[PDB]
Design a protein around this nucleic acid. Structure first.
Length: 74
DNA sequence: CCGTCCCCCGCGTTTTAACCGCCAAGGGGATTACCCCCCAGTCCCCAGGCACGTGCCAGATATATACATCCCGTACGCACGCACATCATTCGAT
């Protein structure tokens, strides 16, 4: 029951509205605990952020690459 | 670098059990006496061990060959997301 990775990621940030930006783990724990994702879930989430930040709609407030915190950037 | 928690930290109770001060007993550590029996001292000595030679052996030493193993590639599954058409929703016309 997993649609395209665009949707839960933005939903997860909406769940915990950190103004400083959500740290990489905060999304990772919730979406796997809440929904059901494939055996290689964590790998897909990391590059999901990586491609998502390249699209520019999300802002990494702290850290470099995937290791930091990210923000919806409205 | 980032983050993440929890698990030590100060701090406030409050219990107590160390710490004190005193009293007592006697075991035993410290001290003396007696001595015998025990190890050092000699002489003689004689065979155990050491210095020297010696070879034989096997211990080695070298050969060739089989086998065990590792890494990479290969293939192949698979579950996957992306992409896609289709199904279903939505704006306009009705």
């Amino acid at each position: 029951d997993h649609p395209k990775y665009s949707d839960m990621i933005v939903a997860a940030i909406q769940a915990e509205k950190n103004r400083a930006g959500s740290s990489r783990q905060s999304i990772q724990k919730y979406i796997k605990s809440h929904y059901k994702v494939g055996e290689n879930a964590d790998s897909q989430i990391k590059l999901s952020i990586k491609r998502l930040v390249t699209t520019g709609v999300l802002k990494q407030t702290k850290g470099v690459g995937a290791s930091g915190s990210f923000r919806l950037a409205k």
